[PDB]
Symmetry: C3
Subunit: 277 residues, 3 copies
Amino acid sequence: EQRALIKSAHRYISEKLEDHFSSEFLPKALVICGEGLSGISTKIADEPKPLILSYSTIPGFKSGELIFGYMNGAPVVLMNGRLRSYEGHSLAETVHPIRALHLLGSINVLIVTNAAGGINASFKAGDLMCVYDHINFPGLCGFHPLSDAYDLELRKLLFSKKKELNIERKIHEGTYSYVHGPTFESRAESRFLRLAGTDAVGMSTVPEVVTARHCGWRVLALSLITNECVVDPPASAHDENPVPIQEGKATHEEVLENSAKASKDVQELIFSVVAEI
Amino acid sequence: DINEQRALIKSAHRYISEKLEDHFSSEFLPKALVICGEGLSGISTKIADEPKPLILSYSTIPGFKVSTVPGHSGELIFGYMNGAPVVLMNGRLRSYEGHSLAETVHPIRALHLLGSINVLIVTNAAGGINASFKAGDLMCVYDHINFPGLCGFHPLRGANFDEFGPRFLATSDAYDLELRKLLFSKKKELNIERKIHEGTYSYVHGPTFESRAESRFLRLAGTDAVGMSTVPEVVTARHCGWRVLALSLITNECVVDPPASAHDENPVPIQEGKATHEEVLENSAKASKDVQELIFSVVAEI
Amino acid sequence: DINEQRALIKSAHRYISEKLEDHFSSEFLPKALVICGEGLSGISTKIADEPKPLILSYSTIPGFKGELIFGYMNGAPVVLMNLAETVHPIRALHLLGSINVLIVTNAAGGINASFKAGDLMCVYDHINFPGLCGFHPLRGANFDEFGPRFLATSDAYDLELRKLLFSKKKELNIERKIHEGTYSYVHGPTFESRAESRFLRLAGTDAVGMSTVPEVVTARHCGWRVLALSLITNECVVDPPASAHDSAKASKDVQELIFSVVAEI
Ligand SMILES: Nc1nc2c(CN3C[C@H](CO)[C@@H](O)C3)c[nH]c2c(=O)[nH]1
Ligand SMILES: Nc1nc2c(CN3C[C@H](CO)[C@@H](O)C3)c[nH]c2c(=O)[nH]1
C-alpha cells in the first residue's frame, strides 16, 4: 500500500528530470542538509541549470525542497528540509524521500549532516564529529522506518579532504545517539547518555541512515557539535553559593548560530568529497 | 491533530472560566496548580471552607478523561489554601491506564489559559533506587530522567503549541532553586523531622513494579527514585513557562539484588521484599500529614 | 476494548475447552504451556503417542492471529504453542483452570562476554525496555479477574523450576554450557549496532532478543510460575568499528531438557 505512494513520487520526479535536463540526469549521491547546511545550495553549478522541486508538489512528501544539479562535476540531489519524528511524523514518512529517490537506480551514497549536542566531555561547540556508529533509542521500542552502517572508506576520504583543504576545525570520530526530542537533555539524561557510550546526541538522522543502508547505499554522516550538553548536578537547595540552574542551558538560537558558523567548512568538505564518490 | 487539541483546550478553559466567574464574587486567579499524588488526596482538606470552594468533576470538563481506577474519577478543586488561591488536581491520569501523554497533560494547558498560574507543585509516591533512601523519607526532585521520552513517548511530540512555549525546550533548568529552598525553609519552620532528600526522579510507564535488573539499570543510569507519573506534567508545565516544585514520597525500597541462583546454599526467596500496591498506599497515608503541611505553608509564599 | 477483549478470551476458551472434551476420552487439564522459540519446534515430536494428540490451527481459534498442540509429554498433560493480543492465548488457556507453569524457550544473542555461541542461558531476570517506555502487555484497563493492577516482577523467575532444570542437565549428561542470566527484551533488530550491544552489556544484559518477556509478564499476571531458557545463537560484537585513522545439536539438547523437566511438575 505505501508503495504506490513511493512509485508516484518516483514517477513525478523522473518526469520532471526528463523535462528539465537536456541529458539524462542520474544523481550519484543524496545530501541531506541538516541544521545550518542549507547554503550548500550555492555549491550547485549554474550550468546545466538546477532543478528545484518543492516538497508540496511531490507525492507523499508531507517547507522544504529537493535540488537536482551538479556539484563539483558530480550529479547530486540535495534534501533541503528534513522531517523529524518529534514533529509527529511517522518514521516511514520521514524516510519516504529516500525510498522514492532510490527508484532512480543511480544513487549509491547518502551524505547526511546534522547538529548535535556534545556528550563526550572533550568535545567543544564548533567541533565536527564523523559518525562511525549509533544508538537508536526509539528503535529500542520498535519505532522503525522500515551491519556496519558508516562506510570506512568514506570516513577516510572525509579526513583526507580535511587535510587537503587545510581545514583546522576538529573532526572527531564517534557514536551518535538518536533520541526522540523535542526537549534538550536534563543533566541526568546527558550523564546517562555519556555512560551509555554516546559521543554526540541529536534528534534525527538514524532512521535515514538505516533506510539508506536497506536500499544498498553507503553512508557518510557528519555532526556539527553546536553545544556542550549540561551534565553537572543542579544547584542544591543547601548551597549557599549555587551555580544558577539556567547557566549553560541549550537553546535553539545557539544551535542555529553555531551551525551557521561551521557551515562553510562543512560545505567545502562535502564539495570535495562528492567528486570522489 | 493540533487544531482539535486547541479547540478542546479552548473549550475546557471556557467551561472552567465561566464556572469560576459564576461561583466566586471576586475574580478567582489561582497562583499554583497542585497535583496530588497517590495517597495524598488529604491535601484537599487544606482548602478553606470560606470563600466556598468550587469542585469540578473531570466528567463534566470538555476534553478531560476519567481515570480507569474506580471510584477515583478525578476532580479539580478551586479554593483558598492558607489564603492563597489555588487549584488542586485530585487524581491524575496516568499513561499506563491507556491515556495518551497528551491526554494526561491537557489539564495543564487548559488551566494555563486562566492567565494566573505560574507554579506547578506536583507530588507523587516513588520506589527508592538510591540505596540510602528508606521508606517514609521524602525526596525533593531537583532533576529527572525521561527515558520514555528519549525513546519516543513524549508529551511534546507533534506540532508545537507556539502560543504556549518554544519548539525546543531545555530541561537542565526544570526544578527551580528558590522553590526548593522555600520547601526546606518550611520544613525548618514546621519542625518536621522526616528526611527530605534531593535527587533525580525517573518516569517509567508501568504498571509493573521494576524487576531487579530494571532497578539496577535505573540506578546505574542515575535514578534516585522511580515512579509512573510526574515527568510529563513537569515538562508541559515548563513548556507553558511555569516554575516547578516536585516532591516524591519514598513508599518502598526497590529490589536491586540479583535473585537467588540455582546454586545458592541458603537462598534468599525471590519474593522477599516484593513491592505491593497496599505497601505503597499505607506508606503514603503515613506521610500525608507532613506533605500536606509543607504544601499549605509553601503556597502562602509563592 | 477491555470488554471485547474479555469476550474474545472467553470465546477462545469456550472453543478450546469444547474441542478438548470431544477429542480426549478423559479430561485433558494441562499443567504447562510450552512456548517453543525460534528453531525449537522439535518438542512437537516428543509429545506422547497415546492418547493421540489434539492439534488446533490458530486460524480456527476465535481471536487468535502456528498451532496449539494438546497431548501428553513424558507423562504430563501439556499444551504447546508452535501485544495484548500477543498474550490473548495465555489468558484463554488460563481459563482452563489447570496450567500453572509457562516454559518459554527462545534464541538470543550473547551480550555477556563469557557467553559463547551454542551455550544456554537459563533466565532468572529480565529487562523489559519497551515496557519501561509504553509498549507493555498490561497497558490499559486491568483484567481484575486475572491479577493485580500493579504486578511485581522482582519475583518473576521461580528458583525451584531453575534448580529443576539444572538437575535434568546432569542426569542426561549434557556437556553444553548453561549460564544463569538476564534477558533483555528489545524491539530492535538483529541489526543491532556495536554501540547498541555495548549499551545493552553495560545496562546489565546477558542475552538479548525480541520475545519472551511479554509472555512472562502475562503469565505472572495470571499467577503462573515461569521457566525461561535461551539458546545463544551468536556472540554480539561490542568493539567499536575501525577508525579512519588506523545447529540442531542445541535444539535436540533443549528438547530432552524440557521433556525431562515436564515430568516433575
Ligand atoms: N537531543 C539533542 N539534539 C540536539 C541538536 C540537534 N537538533 C537541533 C534542533 C534543536 O535546536 C533539533 O532538531 C535537535 C543540537 N543540539 C542538541 C542537543 O543538545 N540535544
Ligand atoms: N515504577 C514505580 N512506581 C512506583 C510508585 C508510584 N505509583 C504508585 C502506584 C503503585 O502503587 C503506581 O501508580 C506507581 C510507588 N512505588 C513505585 C515503584 O516501586 N515503582
